Design a protein around this ligand. Sequence first.
Ligand SMILES: [Zn+2]
Ligand SMILES: [Zn+2]
Ligand SMILES: [Zn+2]
Length: 278
Amino acid sequence: SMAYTRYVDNNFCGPDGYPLECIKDLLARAGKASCTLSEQLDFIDTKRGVYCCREHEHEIAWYTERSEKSYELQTPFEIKLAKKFDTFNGECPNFVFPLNSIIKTIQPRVEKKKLDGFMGRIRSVYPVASPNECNQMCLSTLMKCDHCGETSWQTGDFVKATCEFCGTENLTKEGATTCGYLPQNAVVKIYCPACHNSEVGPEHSLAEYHNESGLKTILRKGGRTIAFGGCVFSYVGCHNKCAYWVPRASANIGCNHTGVVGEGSEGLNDNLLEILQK
Ligand SMILES: [Zn+2]
Ligand SMILES: [Zn+2]
Ligand SMILES: [Zn+2]
């Protein structure tokens, strides 16, 4: 969903599950910005499909089932199923979800008399009496350790994980990720710079959190988003100077496992599937 990227699903959305600017422009110029996805994809095929943008090339790596919402409005949250495109030969690039997966998106909760502070914010996602009922997820990154130089599944969150071998804390590196088995009231709870630092404070805005978080997000339709381990995370709010993210979208490859995404994920998922059968 950058300016241009080659690889798309059969619905012409990018590897991050978001629409391409170039395709959005093409649809706008033809006066089909607010048409259904089916009608926009009919028109894209009229413009020669993956060659629809004359000045660069696209290539379909994934089959995905999405909603009928206008291309411009499509998000990872609109994906329901993800697999390799039947007619694409070779290894797929990195994709927001694991192959042969089903996706569930969190519905925003309705509440007559909304609670104050974090309780109102978290109850917009999960029906919990307290924050204690939320279960923090196990986000694992297959990466090399700064200390012992072993490459293993290090467990933690989006930003940091711990080496099982030597116990050294490592910043999350590029490589295969997983959110493991999705628990009930699944949350990611991380240190909040905006809460802790004396310049901002724990009554900071939603905007202020993202400004000070040090995490890479883009303000886009569906809100600011972080993709990790076969989930797409949205920011709920802060409780006790800790930022709470929820898997607004979560993949399921079987047994409620969020599966593996990133370098080598196809091999790792195939190996994982043979365990989950048992
Ligand atoms: Zn294009
Ligand atoms: Zn280590
Ligand atoms: Zn905060």
